[PDB]
Short mmCIF file of C-alpha atoms and ligand atoms in Angstrom, two decimals:
data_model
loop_
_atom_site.label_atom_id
_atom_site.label_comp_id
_atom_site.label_asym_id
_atom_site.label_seq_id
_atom_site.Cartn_x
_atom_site.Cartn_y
_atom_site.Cartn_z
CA UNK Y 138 9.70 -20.63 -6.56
CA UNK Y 139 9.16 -18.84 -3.28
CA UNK Y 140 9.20 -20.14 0.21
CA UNK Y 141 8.46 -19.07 3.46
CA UNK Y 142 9.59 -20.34 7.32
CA UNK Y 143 7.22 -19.20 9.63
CA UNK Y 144 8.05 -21.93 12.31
CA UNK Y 145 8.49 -19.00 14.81
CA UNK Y 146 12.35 -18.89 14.90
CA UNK Y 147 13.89 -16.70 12.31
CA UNK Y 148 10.61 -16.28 10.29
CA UNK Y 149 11.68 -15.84 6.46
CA UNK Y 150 11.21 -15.45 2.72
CA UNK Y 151 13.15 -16.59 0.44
CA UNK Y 152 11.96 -15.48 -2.68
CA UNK Y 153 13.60 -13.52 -5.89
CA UNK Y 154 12.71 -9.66 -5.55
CA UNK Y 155 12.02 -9.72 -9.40
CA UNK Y 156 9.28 -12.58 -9.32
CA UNK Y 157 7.46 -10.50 -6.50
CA UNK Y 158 8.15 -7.15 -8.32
CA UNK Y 159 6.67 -8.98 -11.97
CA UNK Y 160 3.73 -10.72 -10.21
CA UNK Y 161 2.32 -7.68 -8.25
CA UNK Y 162 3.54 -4.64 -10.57
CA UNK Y 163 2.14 -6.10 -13.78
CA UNK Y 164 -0.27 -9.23 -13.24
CA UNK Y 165 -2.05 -8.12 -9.80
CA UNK Y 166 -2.07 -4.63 -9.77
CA UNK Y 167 -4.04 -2.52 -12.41
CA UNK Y 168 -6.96 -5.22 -11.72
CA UNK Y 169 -6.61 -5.24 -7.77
CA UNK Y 170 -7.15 -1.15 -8.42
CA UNK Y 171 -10.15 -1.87 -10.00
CA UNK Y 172 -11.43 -3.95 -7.35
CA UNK Y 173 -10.54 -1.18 -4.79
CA UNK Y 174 -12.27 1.77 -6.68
CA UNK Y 175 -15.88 -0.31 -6.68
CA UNK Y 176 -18.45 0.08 -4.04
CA UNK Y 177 -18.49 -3.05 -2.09
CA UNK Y 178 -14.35 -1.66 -1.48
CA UNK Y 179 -14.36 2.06 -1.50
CA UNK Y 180 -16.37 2.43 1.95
CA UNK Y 181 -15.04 1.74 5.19
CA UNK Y 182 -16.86 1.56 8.34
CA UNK Y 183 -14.99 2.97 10.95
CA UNK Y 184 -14.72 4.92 14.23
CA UNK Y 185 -11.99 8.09 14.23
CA UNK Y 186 -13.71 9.57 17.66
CA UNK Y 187 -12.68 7.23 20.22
CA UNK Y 188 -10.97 9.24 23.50
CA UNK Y 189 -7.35 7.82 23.69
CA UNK Y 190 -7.70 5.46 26.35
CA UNK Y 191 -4.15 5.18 27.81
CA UNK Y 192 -3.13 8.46 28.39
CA UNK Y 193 -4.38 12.18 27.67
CA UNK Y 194 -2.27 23.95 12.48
CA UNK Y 195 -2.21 23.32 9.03
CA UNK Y 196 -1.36 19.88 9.30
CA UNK Y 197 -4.57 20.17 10.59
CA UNK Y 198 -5.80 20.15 7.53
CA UNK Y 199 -3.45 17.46 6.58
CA UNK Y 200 -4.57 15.30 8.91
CA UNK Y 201 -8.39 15.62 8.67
CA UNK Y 202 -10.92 12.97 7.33
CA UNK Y 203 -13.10 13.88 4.44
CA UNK Y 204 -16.30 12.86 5.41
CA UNK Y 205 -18.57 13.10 2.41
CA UNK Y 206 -20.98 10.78 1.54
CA UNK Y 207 -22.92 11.61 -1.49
CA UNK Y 208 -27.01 11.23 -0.39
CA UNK Y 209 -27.21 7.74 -2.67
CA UNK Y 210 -24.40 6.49 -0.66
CA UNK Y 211 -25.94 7.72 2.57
CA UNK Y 212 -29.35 5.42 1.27
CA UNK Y 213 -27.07 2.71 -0.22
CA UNK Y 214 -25.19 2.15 3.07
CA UNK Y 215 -28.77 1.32 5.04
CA UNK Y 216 -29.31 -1.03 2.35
CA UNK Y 217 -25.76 -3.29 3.36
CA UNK Y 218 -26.67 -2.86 7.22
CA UNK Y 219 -30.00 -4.18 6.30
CA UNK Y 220 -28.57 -7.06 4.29
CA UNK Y 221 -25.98 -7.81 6.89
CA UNK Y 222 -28.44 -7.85 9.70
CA UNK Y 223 -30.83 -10.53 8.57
CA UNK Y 224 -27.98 -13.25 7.50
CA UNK Y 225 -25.24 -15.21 8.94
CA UNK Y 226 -23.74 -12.50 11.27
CA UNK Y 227 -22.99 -12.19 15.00
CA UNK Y 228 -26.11 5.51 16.28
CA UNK Y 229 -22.88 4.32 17.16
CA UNK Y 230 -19.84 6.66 16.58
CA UNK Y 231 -18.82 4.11 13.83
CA UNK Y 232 -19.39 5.95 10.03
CA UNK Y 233 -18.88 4.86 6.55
CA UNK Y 234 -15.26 6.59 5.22
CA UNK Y 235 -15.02 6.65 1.30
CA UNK Y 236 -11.74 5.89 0.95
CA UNK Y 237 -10.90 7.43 -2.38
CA UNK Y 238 -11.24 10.96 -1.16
CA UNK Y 239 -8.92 9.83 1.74
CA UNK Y 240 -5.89 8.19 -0.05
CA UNK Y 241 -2.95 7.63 2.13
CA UNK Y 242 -0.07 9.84 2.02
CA UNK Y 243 2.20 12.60 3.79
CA UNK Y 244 -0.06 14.24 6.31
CA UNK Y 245 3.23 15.85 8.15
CA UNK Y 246 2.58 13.70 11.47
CA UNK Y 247 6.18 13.77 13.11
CA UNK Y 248 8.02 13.66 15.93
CA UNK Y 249 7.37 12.74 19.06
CA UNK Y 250 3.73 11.98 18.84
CA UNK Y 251 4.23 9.78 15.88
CA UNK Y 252 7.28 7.89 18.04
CA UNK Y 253 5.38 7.30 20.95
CA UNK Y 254 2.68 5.43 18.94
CA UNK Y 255 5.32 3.46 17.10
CA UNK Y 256 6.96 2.64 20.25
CA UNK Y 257 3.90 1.17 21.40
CA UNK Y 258 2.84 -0.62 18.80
CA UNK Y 259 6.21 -2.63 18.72
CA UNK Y 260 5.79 -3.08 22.05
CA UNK Y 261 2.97 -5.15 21.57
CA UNK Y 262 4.96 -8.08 20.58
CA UNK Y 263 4.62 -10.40 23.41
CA UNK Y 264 3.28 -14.14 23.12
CA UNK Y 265 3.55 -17.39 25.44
CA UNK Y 266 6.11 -19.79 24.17
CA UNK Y 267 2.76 -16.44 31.53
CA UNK Y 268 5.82 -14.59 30.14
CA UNK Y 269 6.21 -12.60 26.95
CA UNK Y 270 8.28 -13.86 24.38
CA UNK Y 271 8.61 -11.54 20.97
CA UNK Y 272 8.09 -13.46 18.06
CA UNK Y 273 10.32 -12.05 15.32
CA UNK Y 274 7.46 -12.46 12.88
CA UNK Y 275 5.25 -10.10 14.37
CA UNK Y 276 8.09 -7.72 14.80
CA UNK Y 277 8.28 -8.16 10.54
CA UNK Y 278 4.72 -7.45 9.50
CA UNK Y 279 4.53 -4.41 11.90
CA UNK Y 280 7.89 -3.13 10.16
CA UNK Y 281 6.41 -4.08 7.00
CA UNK Y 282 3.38 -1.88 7.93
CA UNK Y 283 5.72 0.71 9.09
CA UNK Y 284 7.82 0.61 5.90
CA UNK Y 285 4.33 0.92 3.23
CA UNK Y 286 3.08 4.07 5.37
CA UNK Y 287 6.93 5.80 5.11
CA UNK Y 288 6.61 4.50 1.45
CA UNK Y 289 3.30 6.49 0.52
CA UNK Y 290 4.41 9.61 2.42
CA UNK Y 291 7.53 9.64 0.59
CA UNK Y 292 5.94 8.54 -2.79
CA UNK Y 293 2.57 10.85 -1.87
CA UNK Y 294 4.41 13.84 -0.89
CA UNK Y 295 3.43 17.21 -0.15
CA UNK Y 296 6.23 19.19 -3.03
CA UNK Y 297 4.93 22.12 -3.36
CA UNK Y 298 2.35 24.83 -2.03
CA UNK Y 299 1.73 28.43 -2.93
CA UNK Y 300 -1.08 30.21 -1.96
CA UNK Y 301 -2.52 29.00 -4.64
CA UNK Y 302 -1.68 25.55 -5.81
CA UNK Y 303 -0.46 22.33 -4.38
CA UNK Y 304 1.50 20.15 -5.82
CA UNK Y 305 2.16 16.52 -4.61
CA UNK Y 306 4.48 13.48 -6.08
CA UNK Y 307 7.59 11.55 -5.82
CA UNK Y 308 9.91 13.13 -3.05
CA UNK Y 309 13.31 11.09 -3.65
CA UNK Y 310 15.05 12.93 -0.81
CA UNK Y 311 12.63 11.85 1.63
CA UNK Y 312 12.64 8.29 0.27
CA UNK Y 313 16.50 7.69 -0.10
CA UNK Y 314 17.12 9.29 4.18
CA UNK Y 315 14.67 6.49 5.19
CA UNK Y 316 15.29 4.03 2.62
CA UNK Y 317 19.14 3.69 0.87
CA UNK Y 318 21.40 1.49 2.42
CA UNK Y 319 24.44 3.98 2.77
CA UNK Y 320 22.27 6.91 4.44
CA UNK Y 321 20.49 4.11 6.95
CA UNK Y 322 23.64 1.87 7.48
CA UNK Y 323 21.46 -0.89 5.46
CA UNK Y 324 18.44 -0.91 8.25
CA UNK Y 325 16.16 0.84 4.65
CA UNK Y 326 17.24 -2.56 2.63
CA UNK Y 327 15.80 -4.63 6.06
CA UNK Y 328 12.92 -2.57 6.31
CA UNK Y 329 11.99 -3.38 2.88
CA UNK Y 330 12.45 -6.82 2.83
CA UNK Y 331 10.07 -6.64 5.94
CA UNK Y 332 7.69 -4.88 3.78
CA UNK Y 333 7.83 -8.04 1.08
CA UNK Y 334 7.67 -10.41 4.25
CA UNK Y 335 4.48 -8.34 5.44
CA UNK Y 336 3.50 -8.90 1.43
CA UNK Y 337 3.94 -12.36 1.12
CA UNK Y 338 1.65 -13.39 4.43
CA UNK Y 339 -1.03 -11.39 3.44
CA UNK Y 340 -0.85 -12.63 -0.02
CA UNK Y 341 -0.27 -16.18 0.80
CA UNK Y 342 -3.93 -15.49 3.33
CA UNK Y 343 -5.85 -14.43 0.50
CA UNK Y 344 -4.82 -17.43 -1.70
CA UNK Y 345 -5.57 -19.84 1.24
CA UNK Y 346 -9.41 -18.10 1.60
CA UNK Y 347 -10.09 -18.47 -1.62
CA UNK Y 348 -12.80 -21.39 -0.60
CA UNK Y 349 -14.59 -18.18 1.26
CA UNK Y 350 -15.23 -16.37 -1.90
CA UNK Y 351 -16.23 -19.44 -4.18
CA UNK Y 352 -19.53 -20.42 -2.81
CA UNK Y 353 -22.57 -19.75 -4.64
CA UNK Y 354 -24.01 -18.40 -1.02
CA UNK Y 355 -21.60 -15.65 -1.07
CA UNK Y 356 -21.92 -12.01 -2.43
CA UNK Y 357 -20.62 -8.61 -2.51
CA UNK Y 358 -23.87 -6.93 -1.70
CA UNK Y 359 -24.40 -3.87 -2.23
CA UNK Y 360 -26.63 -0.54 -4.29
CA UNK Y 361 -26.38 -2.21 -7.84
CA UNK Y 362 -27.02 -6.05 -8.75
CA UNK Y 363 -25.89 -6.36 -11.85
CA UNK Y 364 -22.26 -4.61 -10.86
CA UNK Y 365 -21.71 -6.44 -7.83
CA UNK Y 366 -21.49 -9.68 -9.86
CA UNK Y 367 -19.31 -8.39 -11.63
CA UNK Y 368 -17.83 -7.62 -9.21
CA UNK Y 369 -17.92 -10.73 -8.11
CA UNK Y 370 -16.01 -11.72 -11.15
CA UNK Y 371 -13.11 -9.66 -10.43
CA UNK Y 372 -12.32 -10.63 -7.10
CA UNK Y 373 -12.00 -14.16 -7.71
CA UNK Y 374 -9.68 -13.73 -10.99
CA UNK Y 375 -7.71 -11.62 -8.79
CA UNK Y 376 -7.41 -14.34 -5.76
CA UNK Y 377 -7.35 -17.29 -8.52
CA UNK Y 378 -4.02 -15.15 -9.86
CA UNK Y 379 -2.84 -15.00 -6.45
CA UNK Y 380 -3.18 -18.71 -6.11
CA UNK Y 381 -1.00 -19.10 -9.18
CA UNK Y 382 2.26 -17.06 -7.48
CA UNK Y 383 4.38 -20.13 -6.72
CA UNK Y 384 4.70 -19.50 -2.69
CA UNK Y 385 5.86 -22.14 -0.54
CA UNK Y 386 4.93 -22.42 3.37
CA UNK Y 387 6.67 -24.66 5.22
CA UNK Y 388 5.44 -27.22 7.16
CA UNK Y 389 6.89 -26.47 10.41
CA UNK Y 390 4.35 -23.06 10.44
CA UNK Y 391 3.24 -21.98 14.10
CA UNK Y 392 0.08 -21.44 11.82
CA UNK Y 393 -0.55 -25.10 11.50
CA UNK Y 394 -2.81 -26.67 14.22
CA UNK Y 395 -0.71 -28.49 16.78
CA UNK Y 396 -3.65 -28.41 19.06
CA UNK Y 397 -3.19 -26.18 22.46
CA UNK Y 398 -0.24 -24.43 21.23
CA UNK Y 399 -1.73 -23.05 18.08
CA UNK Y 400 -5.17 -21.82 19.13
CA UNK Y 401 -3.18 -20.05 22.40
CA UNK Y 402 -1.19 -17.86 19.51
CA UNK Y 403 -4.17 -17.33 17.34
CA UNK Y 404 -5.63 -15.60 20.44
CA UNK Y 405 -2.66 -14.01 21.44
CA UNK Y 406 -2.54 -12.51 17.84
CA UNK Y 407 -6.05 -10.90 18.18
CA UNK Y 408 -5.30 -9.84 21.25
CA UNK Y 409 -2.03 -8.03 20.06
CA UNK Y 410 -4.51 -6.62 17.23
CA UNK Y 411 -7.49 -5.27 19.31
CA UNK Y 412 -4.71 -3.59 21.73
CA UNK Y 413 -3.18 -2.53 18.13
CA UNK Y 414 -6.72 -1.06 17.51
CA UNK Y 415 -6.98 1.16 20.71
CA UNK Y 416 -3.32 2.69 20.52
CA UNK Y 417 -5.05 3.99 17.05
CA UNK Y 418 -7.30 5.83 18.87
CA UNK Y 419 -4.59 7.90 20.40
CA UNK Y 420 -3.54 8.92 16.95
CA UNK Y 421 -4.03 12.88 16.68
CA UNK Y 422 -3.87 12.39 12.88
CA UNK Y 423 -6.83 11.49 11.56
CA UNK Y 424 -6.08 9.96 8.12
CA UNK Y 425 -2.97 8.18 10.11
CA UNK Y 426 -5.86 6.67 12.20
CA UNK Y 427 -8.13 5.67 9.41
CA UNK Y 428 -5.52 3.96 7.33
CA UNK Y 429 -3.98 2.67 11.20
CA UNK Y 430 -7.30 1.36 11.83
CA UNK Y 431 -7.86 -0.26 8.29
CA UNK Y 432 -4.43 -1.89 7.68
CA UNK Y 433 -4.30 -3.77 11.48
CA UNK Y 434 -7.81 -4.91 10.71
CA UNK Y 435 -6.39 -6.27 7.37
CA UNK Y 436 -3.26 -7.79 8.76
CA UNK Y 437 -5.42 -9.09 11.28
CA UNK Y 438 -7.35 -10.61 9.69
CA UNK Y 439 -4.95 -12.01 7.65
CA UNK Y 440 -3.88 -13.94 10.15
CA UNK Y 441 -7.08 -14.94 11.54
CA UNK Y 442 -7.23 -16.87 8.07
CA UNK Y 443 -3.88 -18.03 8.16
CA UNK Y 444 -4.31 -20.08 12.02
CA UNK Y 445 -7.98 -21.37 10.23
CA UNK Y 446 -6.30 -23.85 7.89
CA UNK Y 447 -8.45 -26.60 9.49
CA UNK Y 448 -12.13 -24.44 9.54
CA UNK Y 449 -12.22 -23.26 5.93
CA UNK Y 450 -10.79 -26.46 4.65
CA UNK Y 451 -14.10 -28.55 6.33
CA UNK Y 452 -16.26 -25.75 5.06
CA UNK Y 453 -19.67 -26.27 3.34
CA UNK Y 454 -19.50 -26.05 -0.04
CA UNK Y 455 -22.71 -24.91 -0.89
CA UNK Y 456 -24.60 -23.66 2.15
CA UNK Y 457 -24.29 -20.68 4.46
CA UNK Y 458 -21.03 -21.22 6.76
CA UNK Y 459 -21.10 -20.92 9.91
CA UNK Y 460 -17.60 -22.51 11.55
CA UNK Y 461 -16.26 -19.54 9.69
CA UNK Y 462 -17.41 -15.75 8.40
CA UNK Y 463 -15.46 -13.06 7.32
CA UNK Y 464 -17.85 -9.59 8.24
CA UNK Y 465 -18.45 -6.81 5.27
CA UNK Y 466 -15.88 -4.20 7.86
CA UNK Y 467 -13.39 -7.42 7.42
CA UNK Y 468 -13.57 -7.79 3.78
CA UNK Y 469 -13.24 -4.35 2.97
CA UNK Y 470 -10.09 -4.11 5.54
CA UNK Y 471 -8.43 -6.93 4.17
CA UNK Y 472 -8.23 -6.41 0.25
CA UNK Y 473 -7.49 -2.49 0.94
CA UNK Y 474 -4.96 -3.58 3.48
CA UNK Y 475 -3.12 -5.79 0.90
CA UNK Y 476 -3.98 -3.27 -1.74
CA UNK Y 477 -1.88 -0.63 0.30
CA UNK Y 478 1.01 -3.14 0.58
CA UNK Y 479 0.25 -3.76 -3.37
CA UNK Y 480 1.07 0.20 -4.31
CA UNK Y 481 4.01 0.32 -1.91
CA UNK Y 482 5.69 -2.75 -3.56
CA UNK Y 483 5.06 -0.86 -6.86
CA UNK Y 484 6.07 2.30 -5.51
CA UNK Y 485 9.59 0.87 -5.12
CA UNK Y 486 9.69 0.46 -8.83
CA UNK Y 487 8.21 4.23 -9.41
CA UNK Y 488 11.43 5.22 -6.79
CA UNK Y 489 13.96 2.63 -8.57
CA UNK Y 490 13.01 3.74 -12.17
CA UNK Y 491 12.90 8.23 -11.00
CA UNK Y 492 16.93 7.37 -9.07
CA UNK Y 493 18.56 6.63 -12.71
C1 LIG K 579 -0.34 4.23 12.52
C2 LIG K 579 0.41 5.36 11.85
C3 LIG K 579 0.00 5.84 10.61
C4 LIG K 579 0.76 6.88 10.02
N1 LIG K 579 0.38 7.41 8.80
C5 LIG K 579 1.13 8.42 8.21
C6 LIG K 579 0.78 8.96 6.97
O1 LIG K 579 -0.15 8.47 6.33
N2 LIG K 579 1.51 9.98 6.43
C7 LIG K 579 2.54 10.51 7.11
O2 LIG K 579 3.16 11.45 6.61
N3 LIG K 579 2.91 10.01 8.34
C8 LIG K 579 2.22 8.96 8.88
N4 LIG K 579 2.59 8.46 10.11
C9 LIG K 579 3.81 9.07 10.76
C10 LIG K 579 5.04 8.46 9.97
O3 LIG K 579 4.97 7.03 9.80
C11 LIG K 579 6.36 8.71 10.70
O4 LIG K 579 6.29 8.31 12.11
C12 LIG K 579 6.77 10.19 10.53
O5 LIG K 579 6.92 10.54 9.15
C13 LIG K 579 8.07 10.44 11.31
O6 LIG K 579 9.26 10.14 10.58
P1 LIG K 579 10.53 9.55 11.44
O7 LIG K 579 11.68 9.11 10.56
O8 LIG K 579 10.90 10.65 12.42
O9 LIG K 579 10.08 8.35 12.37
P2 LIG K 579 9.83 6.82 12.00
O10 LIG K 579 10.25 6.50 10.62
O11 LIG K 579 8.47 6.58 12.44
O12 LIG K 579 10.82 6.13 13.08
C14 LIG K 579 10.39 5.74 14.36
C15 LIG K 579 11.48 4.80 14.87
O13 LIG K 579 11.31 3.51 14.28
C16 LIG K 579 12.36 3.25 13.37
N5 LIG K 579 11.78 2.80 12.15
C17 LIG K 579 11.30 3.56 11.08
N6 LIG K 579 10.81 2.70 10.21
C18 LIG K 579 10.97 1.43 10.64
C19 LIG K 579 10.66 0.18 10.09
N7 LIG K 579 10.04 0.05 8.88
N8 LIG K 579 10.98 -0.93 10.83
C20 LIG K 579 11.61 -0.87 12.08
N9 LIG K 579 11.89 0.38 12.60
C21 LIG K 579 11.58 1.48 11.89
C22 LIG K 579 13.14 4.51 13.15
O14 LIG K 579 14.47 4.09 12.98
C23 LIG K 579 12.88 5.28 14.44
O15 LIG K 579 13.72 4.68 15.40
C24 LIG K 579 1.86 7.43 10.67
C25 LIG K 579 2.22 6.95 11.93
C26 LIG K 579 1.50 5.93 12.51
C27 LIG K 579 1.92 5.46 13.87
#
């Protein structure tokens, strides 16, 4: 029994690390990988070649997006535009990433350049109450975001190159300096638990747009028609588990719909996110910036879906909606968003069971 104050205060979980560590390591995860390797989930539209519009080696090839699309995919991805064009939604430099050759992980972006972003990013936190206030819970999901991108580098890392052969995996040094309590003067601990509060929201969105995904109207369109029911299939035994996790919101939420004061912070969160959006197009690494790109669309739209309690609940049940649409670029962002959040929470097992 889980349960979560977001009233805007001091923004909280309480919820047993073991029940989250159970739920996600043994009954979400091998199926939510699934999901994630299929087409519908594999390919990302995105733009990496945006100019940085604030200011002005070998981890080069760290850093660089693999850009591959096999020539079916290439056909397959006109198809979806097509599809998407004619029903209910609203050459650019925006191109379809296949996110498997691109998995996230230790790139060796460091120092300075890597600071400044974060800097900015937290800086971002800064919502009416004409003057900035920082909520704390914005301040948690970013350092939950933060803490599942230091979690992949250190579980993803770079061991071992020769001339030859590379060799990545675990890196427990790198983990415990950013992560033990004794080496970080307990800030690693806090970090994590942000990472489980950053878990928890975005779970506790995809539970509560579960209506989205249950019409017969809807579909994961793409290349294949049998497959993409299927498909189909998956996804909903994966949000209908998600359901079943026994999380508890509070009533007091500055998600629920007090009139002027909540649609003023829904706005003020996609405001934050957009801004979010452009500061990734000052990232020099490029991977950094697809992943950067992805996992702020994810988050939010998470809580897009969270503040739009009141829309999905009055939603049609059987036609096409229109108070309320989720694009392909935002369903593809959100479950690989929570999906990244997924393997870092079971990464901390991997790094608990290899420190015995
Ligand atoms: C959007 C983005 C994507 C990135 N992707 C990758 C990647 O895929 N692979 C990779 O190797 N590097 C990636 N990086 C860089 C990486 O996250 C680190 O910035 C880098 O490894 C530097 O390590 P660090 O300890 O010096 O700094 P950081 O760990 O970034 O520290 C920056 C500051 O914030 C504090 N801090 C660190 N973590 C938290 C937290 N969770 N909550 C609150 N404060 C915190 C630190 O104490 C320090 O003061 C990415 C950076 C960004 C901005």
């Amino acid at each position: 029994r889980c349960f979560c104050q977001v009233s805007g205060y001091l923004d909280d979980c309480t919820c047993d690390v073991e029940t989250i560590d159970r739920f996600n390591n043994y009954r979400l995860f091998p199926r939510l990988q699934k999901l994630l390797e299929s087409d519908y989930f594999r390919y990302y539209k995105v733009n990496l070649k945006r100019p940085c519009p604030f200011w002005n080696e070998q981890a080069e090839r760290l850093g660089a997006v693999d850009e591959s699309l096999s020539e079916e995919t290439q056909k397959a991805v006109l198809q979806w535009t097509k599809h998407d064009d004619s029903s209910d939604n609203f050459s650019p430099e925006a191109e379809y990433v296949d996110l498997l050759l691109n998995p996230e992980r230790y790139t060796g972006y460091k120092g300075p350049d890597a600071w400044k972003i974060w800097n900015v990013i937290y800086e971002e936190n800064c919502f009416k109450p004409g003057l900035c206030v920082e909520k704390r819970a914005f301040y948690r999901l970013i350092s939950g975001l933060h803490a599942s991108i230091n979690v992949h580098l250190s579980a993803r890392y770079l061991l071992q190159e020769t001339w030859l052969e590379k060799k990545w995996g675990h890196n427990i040094t790198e983990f415990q300096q950013r992560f033990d309590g004794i080496l970080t003067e307990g800030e690693g601990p806090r970090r994590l638990k942000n990472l489980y509060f950053l878990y928890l929201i975005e779970l506790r969105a995809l539970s509560k747009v579960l209506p989205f995904f249950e019409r017969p109207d809807f579909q994961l369109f793409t290349g294949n028609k049998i497959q993409d029911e299927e498909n189909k299939m998956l996804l909903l035994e994966i949000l209908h588990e998600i359901k079943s996790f026994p999380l508890h919101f509070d009533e007091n939420s500055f998600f629920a719909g007090d009139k002027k004061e909540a649609h003023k912070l829904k706005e003020d969160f996609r405001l934050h996110f957009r801004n979010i959006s452009r500061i990734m197009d000052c990232v020099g690494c490029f991977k950094c910036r697809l992943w950067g790109k992805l996992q702020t669309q994810g988050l939010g739209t998470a809580l897009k879906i969270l503040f739009s309690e009141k829309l999905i609940a009055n939603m049609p049940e059987s036609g096409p909606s229109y108070e309320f649409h989720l694009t392909r670029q935002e369903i593809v962002s959100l479950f690989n968003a929570f999906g990244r959040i997924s393997t870092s929470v079971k990464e901390l097992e991997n790094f608990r069971n290899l420190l015995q």
